[PDB]
Design a protein around this ligand. Structure first.
Ligand SMILES: Nc1ncnc2c1ncn2[C@@H]1O[C@H](COP(=O)(O)OP(=O)(O)NP(=O)(O)O)[C@@H](O)[C@H]1O
Ligand SMILES: Nc1ncnc2c1ncn2[C@@H]1O[C@H](COP(=O)(O)OP(=O)(O)NP(=O)(O)O)[C@@H](O)[C@H]1O
Ligand SMILES: [Mg+2]
Ligand SMILES: [Mg+2]
Ligand SMILES: [Zn+2]
Lengths: 197, 171, 192, 607, 434
């Protein structure tokens, strides 16, 4: 029956929601269900053909004030349901992509639809437009854990050689350790090169 | 919410419907597009459809028969022992569906019973959410009997307690 | 753009950040008040005057994140607030035991500030710190009993929690608001 | 706090409850007038009421939770109030029973726990080891020969009362206070019937690798003999401890525990997935409506085992075997059996065991057995000592427990022959005879045996005769009504059909479970089918008729005059009579004889 | 005496209320967290008790049968003080002990260990039903109805011999309505197989647990035990008494299906580890490599063994029919092809398994056997290898040498997942999901 593929798709939605919600990291979101979506869209096209057939046959006039009213209303509701299921799935994966944008890309691509890939590009362009405009003195893409300590120990987890910072350098020797201003290394903690606190 | 996935799922559950008219062409609800639906046909329809056909008509096109999940058997089981009851086995979305049913047919008795159920289970749920490790079988059994609605409230509550305990004891 | 767990509550770290904005009394171990016979603090979130005019062991009041930053070094000692002493905590325990319905009027920051100062200023207490930790524990346990008694009376209408701490509130918030919301939704659904 | 001070208030509150929910007053008066009529008219209803425990909750939650959590202090005032109500009706202590919504007090013999002691509990299980019924002395009356007065003595033990009253040593008086000789007056003295049963945990519920637990129930007066062994049951009663538990210093053992019991208040037989299903007039009308559909026998037999492809003639025979023909009793008490006995012998993986398991789930009363797992004694009946008294007593085996039911036997040819020697009397005479241990008795075993077997070789060998293929003696095979031979004979069309059916069968998902989650063309439903079988067994006894006889004799002579024997004829009569039961018809007719002959022709010829 | 008992109780109350590591009062928190979920016990690590005040541990280890009840009493008092408002009821809390003391193997325990705290290990071979023991007897005199009560602690008790002020020769009876009771279970522990001496039969101990330690472990599980090695005076030499262990703590190597069928126990870290393991692309190859890694080749057999360990999905249909989920594999072939070694590995890795050899087996010995309970003089049913393997694997080595009527007995339990017994007046269909 016409609601079923929508239910399969939103059960998929719920499972990917749980997959994302169980962990602190961004779990790489699962494959876009192109096949179920195409089955739904074909089902919607069939329901559209049924409305077309019926609105043709209202010229022929069979009991239309009730019977055609009922057939039309039911198939219309089937289409509303299928729209709701499709938009619920797409809105969840949109929400997760927005989260990933702010977490990393605004500072696994095969699993997205091409609309979702170019959407993620445009949304990263938007985040960068915000932190590049007014309010620029705040790195709007930065962390939301409050700054507890200004100086921190950090252990170098992967090697990256000599890099400059605002008034000096760090030579990121493997398994060396710094005592350093947190604001001068936060980018490297996010990028996974530095370990502690 | 329109995009609230647990609401989209809850709307997908099915309720017993009794049709009030002979209507051609709707037989695909009875798995054959080529035949009518007849008056006093008794059929299970999803709530996203049954909700609408029970109001449009005049007599509406459908009457909704009392579902088993709100039968006198289940209501009596609720009214004896709210915390021991396996609502998940009754229906995984029983609270959302009860809210929808109360709204669809204004029913003070069910509103009171479901409020009593929610409050008395909220006590036990908070006890298991507050208790933390330093999973316990007594907790592990209780979380089976929770709805998806209650599982969400439990995860959020328990995560709050766990986060607070973490902050208090780890430097 | 906001994480799922920060959507409708504060993290315990954010609660600490809020509490860290409170003034606290310190004994300086540096002198910054210049005699008539060099860098100044030049703050913008809080008052600059006290830090610019410190003299060693003349007690003075500064915002707590600065007091902790100084106490990270030997350059300060943080005077415990008057409530955070053995006799005062014992009076609050007796109040809690004496009045089952009310919460005692400990300040809203009490658990957070006790945690902060027991960890970062363990040597500044006049009382032995093990007793202060014990009595803070007594208070949290008794207040938690009262919390459980209170949750038996959740409503579709409202609730009153006179002297509950910021941290205790924040710990309970994603439960109480959810349950009262769902009781409201059940109740309002019944209305014609 | 002392119970007596609150007894009066508890009495009047239960009196107000009974006055409020006046259906209980109507029930009391209905019982009374029934008993008065049947006493005068020259069979008796008991002085017992089942109260919906929900009604007592909705009336007064405090008293309701008193009945649940402190029954020793709340059932005696409730029964006193009920007795006073019965007294208030026009012209003996009345007892209570309970139904509904026990919550955490709904248990099994496993999860019943020492925390539940002295509470009112409901336990689901299967009955085993029912004791003998014995009169238990509760009051004795004595005529003092010289004094003229009738003295009396009450008695007590831990089973007679919900509270631990002081014990009374079961001694009869013999002398007055003045020393005058007493004489005991039976008939004025009072005895209750007493029975002790073991309720065992349902094996389907027992967790991985643990055997079923069991507990002992006490039943008094009218509850006695409400169950036999093998009955699946729900018992409601007060879970109690009794005895010294080794605290009496003659017992040196430190570690033994206290004995525990349920003192029973009501006993409900079960087949929920009730042993006898209730039928509404809607059910009656639907059952009759379906019986007039011209091909109803095909509909019902196709509705048997819908997850088994094919095997149409076997499912037809199974349906007629669930609805066996009428048993005849003749001069000198001579007897002709009415069961239909089926043997499925054939290749492996031909659904023989699955069909037995469907029958086990569909008949009103079915007992499962397997060839190796069954002893001949374990099949008929076994002598044991009843530890309640110390006497040698028979324990019913599978054939006796299935009386007025069916027996399923899987792996039947794997039996040892001293087991099969014990099958013969059940098949031939519907009875078993015991002549051992000083016990010399005969027991009823009136049941349809349906059995599954393989040939002596792993698969049926069409090069060789049935007596050479089939292990069993002809002296046993001739006792079965229908001997079916099945084969897994390879064929691409049938293999395609059965395969796609089996894949549809394995793609099932029960309601509410998520995808891949583990578990905790018209056809009737199995509950409907069970109701139809019960209706037809109870309410129609088809009478044989000459127009059917003509078909029967024509077909019997034709089958015989081309394995056939004299017993084949009454098998045809049984099959026709059962098909008349399928039609719900008071007469057997030519259609029934035609179907019976067609089906037996399939069984004999492989038609 | 009760002055010293009061001081012991106060010392333990202080241990609960004062013991602290890294800013957390672990025993106050554990006691509260246990009270909320309504398990009235406390798990104490004796390292912490030693570290707090070694005099207390000296008192406890000198005479645990007198000191454990006082510790339990202390726990009750703290439980009330931290969960019930003082001046606006709970049972006696069980004390559970965790320990890392040196183990005594089961065969070495003897007269020097009587009444000492003992740590050991073994395999549980049997678990009895939950008998009921009194914690508190309400008592009265049969004649004058003098009423009193006896509190009982289960460490080695009786009724009084005569009335506490004529009442006759043996005057007291129990009042069961106001008496209180607890669950008591008997376990039989057999010593570890690789610790049995040369040519010895494996020795076993009867042992008891109560309150929350009941139903915690099941037959076949390998466990470590903390308990008071102790004595009881059996009804049966001269001046000879039966040894047993009063269990104070159980720690299985892993917990599985002890009293749970739909319930589970997994930590977040191991669940996440299993989740990311499930997502691995080379998972089947890694699992195949894990099977019998010292056995060369036989790759399709290892693949099949993975499938047998995992099993399919069991199903129950509206027909009422049941569809078999578990999988059966036969290794038939030449000598020294590592078949027995593969069966040994499968019995080693499976969470539930039994290994038997066909010539060592019996029909009853495999499915289930009828037994007669001697002092009851009454028949009962005891489980064979199929019952003990229920929920797992049975490794039937040496299968072709199994006698044919023993071999035939496997058929039903192997396909229908059930054992249909009909013997000695017993009739049941036991489950065997193997
Ligand atoms: N016609 C059928 N339709 C569906 N499943 C079938 C059919 N025939 C056999 N099977 C399947 O075959 C399996 C074995 O069935 P079972 O009843 O044990 O066979 P059997 O005749 O008893 N063989 P055996 O015990 O070795 O003599 C079951 O899982 C059935 O579902
Ligand atoms: N592929 C192999 N890799 C390693 N060791 C092997 C291999 N095959 C055999 N062995 C060794 O040879 C012995 C195999 O014995 P076993 O496991 O009993 O084989 P089997 O197949 O059971 N033969 P049998 O019991 O006579 O039927 C062990 O000592 C193994 O270590
Ligand atoms: Mg079979
Ligand atoms: Mg070998
Ligand atoms: Zn006395």
């Amino acid at each position: 029956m016409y609601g079923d593929l929508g239910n399969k798709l939103v059960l998929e939605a719920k499972r990917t929601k749980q997959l994302y919600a169980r962990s602190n990291q961004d779990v790489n979101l699962p494959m876009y269900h192109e096949d179920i979506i195409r089955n739904i869209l074909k089902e919607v096209s069939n329901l559209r053909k049924n409305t077309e057939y019926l609105k043709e046959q209202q010229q022929l006039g069979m009991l239309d004030d009730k019977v055609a009213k009922c057939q039309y209303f039911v198939t219309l509701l089937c289409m509303e349901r299928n729209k709701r299921c499709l938009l619920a799935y797409q809105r969840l994966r949109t929400d997760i992509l927005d989260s990933m944008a702010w977490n990393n890309n605004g500072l696994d691509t095969n699993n997205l639809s091409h609309q979702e890939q170019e959407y993620l590009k445009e949304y990263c362009d938007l985040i960068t437009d915000l932190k590049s405009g007014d309010l620029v003195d705040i790195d709007l893409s930065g962390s939301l854990v409050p700054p507890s300590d200004v100086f921190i120990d950090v252990r170098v987890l992967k090697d990256a050689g000599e890099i400059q910072t605002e008034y000096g350098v760090f030579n990121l020797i493997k398994d060396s350790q710094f005592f350093v201003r947190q604001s001068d290394v936060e980018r490297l903690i996010q990028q996974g090169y530095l370990q502690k606190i | 919410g329109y995009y609230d996935i647990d609401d989209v799922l809850a709307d997908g559950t099915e309720f017993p419907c009794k049709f009030q008219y002979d209507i051609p062409g709707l037989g695909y609800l009875e798995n054959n597009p080529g035949r009518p639906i007849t008056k006093n046909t008794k059929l299970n329809l999803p709530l996203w459809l049954a909700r609408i056909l029970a109001i449009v008509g005049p007599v509406p096109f459908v009457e909704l028969l009392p579902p088993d999940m709100f039968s006198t058997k289940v209501m009596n089981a609720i009214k004896t022992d709210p915390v021991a009851l396996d609502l998940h086995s009754i229906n995984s979305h029983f609270f959302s569906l009860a809210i929808k049913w109360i709204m669809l047919f204004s029913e003070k008795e069910l509103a009171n019973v479901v409020s009593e159920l929610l409050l008395q289970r909220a006590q036990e749920l908070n006890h298991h959410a507050s208790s933390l490790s330093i999973t316990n079988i007594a907790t592990s059994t209780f979380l089976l009997k929770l709805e998806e609605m209650e599982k969400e409230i439990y995860k959020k509550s328990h995560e709050s307690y766990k986060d607070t305990k973490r902050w208090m004891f780890k430097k | 753009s906001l994480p799922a767990h920060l959507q409708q509550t504060f993290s315990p770290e954010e609660i600490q950040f809020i509490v860290e904005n409170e003034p606290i009394k310190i004994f300086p171990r540096i002198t910054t008040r210049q005699k008539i016979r060099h860098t100044r603090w030049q703050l913008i979130t809080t008052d600059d005057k006290a830090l610019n005019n410190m003299v060693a062991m003349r007690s003075t009041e500064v915002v707590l994140w600065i007091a902790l930053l100084l106490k990270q070094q030997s350059k300060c000692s943080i005077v415990a607030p008057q409530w955070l002493t053995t006799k005062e905590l014992d009076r609050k325990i007796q109040y809690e035991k004496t009045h089952p319905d009310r919460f005692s009027e400990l300040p809203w920051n009490w658990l957070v500030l006790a945690r902060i100062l027991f960890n970062k200023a363990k040597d500044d207490f006049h009382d032995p710190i093990h007793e202060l930790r014990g009595k803070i524990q007594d208070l949290r346990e008794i207040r938690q009993i009262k919390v459980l008694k209170g949750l038996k009376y959740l409503n579709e209408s409202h609730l009153q929690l006179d002297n509950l701490s910021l941290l205790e509130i924040n710990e309970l918030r994603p439960f109480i608001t959810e349950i009262m919301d769902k009781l409201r939704e059940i109740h309002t659904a019944s209305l014609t | 706090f002392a119970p007596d001070a609150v007894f009066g208030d508890r009495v009047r509150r239960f009196q107000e409850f009974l006055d409020t929910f006046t259906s209980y007053r109507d029930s009391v008066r209905s019982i009374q007038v029934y008993n008065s009529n049947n006493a005068a008219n020259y069979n008796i209803l008991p002085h017992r009421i089942i109260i919906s425990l929900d009604d007592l909750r909705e009336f007064d939650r405090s008293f309701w939770s008193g009945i649940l959590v402190e029954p020793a202090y709340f059932i005696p005032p409730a029964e006193k109030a009920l007795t006073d109500l019965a007294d208030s009706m026009d012209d003996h202590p009345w007892k209570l029973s309970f139904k509904g919504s026990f919550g955490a007090h709904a248990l099994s013999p496993r999860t019943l726990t020492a925390q539940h002691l002295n509470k009112l509990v409901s336990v689901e299980g299967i009955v085993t080891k029912t004791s003998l019924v014995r009169p238990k002395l509760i009051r004795s009356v004595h005529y003092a020969a010289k004094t003229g007065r009738f003295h009396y003595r009450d008695y007590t033990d831990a089973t007679t009362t919900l509270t631990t009253r002081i014990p009374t040593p079961a001694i009869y008086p013999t002398e007055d206070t003045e020393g005058n000789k007493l004489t005991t007056e039976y008939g004025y003295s009072t005895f209750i019937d007493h029975q002790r049963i073991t309720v065992q945990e349902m094996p389907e519920m027992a967790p991985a690798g643990q055997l079923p637990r069991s507990i002992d129930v006490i039943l008094d007066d009218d509850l006695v003999d409400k169950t036999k062994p093998g009955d699946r049951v729900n018992v409601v009663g007060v879970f109690k401890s009794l005895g010294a538990g080794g605290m009496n210093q003659s017992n040196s053992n430190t570690l033994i525990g206290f004995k525990t019991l349920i003192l029973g208040n009501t006993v409900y037989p079960l087949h929920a997935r009730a042993a006898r299903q209730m039928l509404t007039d809607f059910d009656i009308r639907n059952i009759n409506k379906l019986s007039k559909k011209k091909d109803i026998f095909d509909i019902l037999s196709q509705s048997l085992a819908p997850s088994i492809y094919g095997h149409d003639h076997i499912k037809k025979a199974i349906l007629l075997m669930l609805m066996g023909g009428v048993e005849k009793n003749l001069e000198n008490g001579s007897h002709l059996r009415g069961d239909i006995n089926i043997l499925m012998v054939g290749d492996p993986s031909t659904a023989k065991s699955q069909l037995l398991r469907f029958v086990l789930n569909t008949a009103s009363l079915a007992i499962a057995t397997t060839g190796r797992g069954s002893s001949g004694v374990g099949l008929t009946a076994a002598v044991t000592t009843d530890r309640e008294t110390g006497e040698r007593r028979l324990e019913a085996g599978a054939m006796v427990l299935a009386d007025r039911g069916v027996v399923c036997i899987d792996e039947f040819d794997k039996m040892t022959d001293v087991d099969r020697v014990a099958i013969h009397e059940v098949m031939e005479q519907q009875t078993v005879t015991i002549a051992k241990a000083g016990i010399h008795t005969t027991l009823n075993a009136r049941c349809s045996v349906i059995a599954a077997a393989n040939p002596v070789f792993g698969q049926y060998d069409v090069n060789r005769d049935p007596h050479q293929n089939i292990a069993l003696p002809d002296s046993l095979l001739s006792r079965f009504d229908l001997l079916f031979v099945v084969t897994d004979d390879i064929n691409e069309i049938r293999d395609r059909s059965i395969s796609e059916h089996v894949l549809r069968t394995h793609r099932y998902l029960p309601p509410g479970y998520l995808e891949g989650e583990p578990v905790r063309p018209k056809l009737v439903t199995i509950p409907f089918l069970r109701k139809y079988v019960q209706y037809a067994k109870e309410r129609v006894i088809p009478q044989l008729t000459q127009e059917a006889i003509n078909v029967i004799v024509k077909n019997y002579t034709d089958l015989r005059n081309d394995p056939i024997t004299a017993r084949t004829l009454e098998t045809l009569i049984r099959l026709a009579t059962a098909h008349a039961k399928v039609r719900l018809s008071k007469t057997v007719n030519k259609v029934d004889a035609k179907v019976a002959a067609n089906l037996l022709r399939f069984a004999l010829l492989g038609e | 005496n009760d002055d010293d008992n009061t001081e012991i109780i106060k010392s333990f109350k202080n241990f609960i209320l004062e013991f602290r590591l890294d800013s957390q009062f672990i025993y106050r928190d554990q006691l509260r967290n246990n009270i909320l979920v309504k398990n009235y016990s406390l798990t104490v690590n004796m390292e912490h008790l030693i570290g707090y005040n070694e005099d207390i541990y000296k008192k406890l280890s000198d005479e645990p049968s007198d000191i454990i009840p006082l510790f339990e009493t202390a726990i009750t008092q703290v439980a009330k003080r931290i969960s019930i408002l003082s001046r606006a009821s709970l049972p006696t809390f069980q004390l559970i002990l965790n320990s890392n003391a040196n183990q005594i193997p089961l065969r070495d325990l003897d007269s020097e260990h009587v009444s000492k705290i003992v740590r050991l290990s073994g395999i549980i071979i049997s678990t009895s039903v939950l008998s009921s023991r009194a914690t508190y007897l309400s008592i009265m005199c049969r004649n004058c109805r003098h009423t009193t009560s006896i509190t009982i602690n289960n460490f080695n008790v009786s009724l009084p011999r005569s009335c506490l002020s004529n009442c006759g020769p043996d005057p007291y009876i129990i009042i069961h309505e106001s008496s209180k009771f607890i669950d008591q279970q008997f376990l039989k522990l057999q010593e570890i197989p690789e610790l049995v001496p040369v040519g010895e039969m494996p020795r076993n101990l009867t042992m008891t647990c109560d309150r929350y330690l009941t139903n915690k472990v099941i037959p076949g599980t390998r466990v470590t035990i903390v308990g008071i090695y102790s004595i009881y005076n059996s009804k049966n030499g001269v001046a000879i008494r039966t040894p047993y262990i009063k269990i104070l703590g159980i720690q299985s190597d892993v917990e599985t299906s002890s009293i749970w069928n739909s319930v589970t126990m997994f930590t977040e870290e191991e669940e996440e580890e299993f989740l990311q393991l499930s997502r691995n692309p080379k998972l089947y190859e890694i699992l195949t490599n894990s099977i019998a890694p010292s056995i060369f080749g036989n790759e399709d057999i290892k693949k099949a063994i993975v499938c047998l360990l995992m099993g399919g999905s069991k199903k129950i249909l509206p027909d009422g029919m049941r569809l078999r989920g578990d999988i059966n594999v036969l290794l038939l072939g030449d000598p020294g092809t590592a078949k027995s070694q593969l069966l040994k590995f499968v019995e080693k890795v499976s969470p539930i398994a039994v290994y038997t050899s066909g010539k060592g087996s019996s029909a009853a010995g495999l499915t289930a056997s009828v037994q007669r309970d001697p002092m009851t003089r009454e028949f009962y049913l005891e489980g064979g290898a199929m019952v003990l393997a229920d929920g797992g694997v049975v490794c039937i080595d040496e299968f072709d040498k199994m006698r044919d009527e023993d071999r035939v007995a496997i058929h039903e339990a192997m396909e229908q997942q059930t054992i249909s017994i009909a013997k000695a007046g017993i009739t049941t269909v036991l489950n065997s999901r193997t």
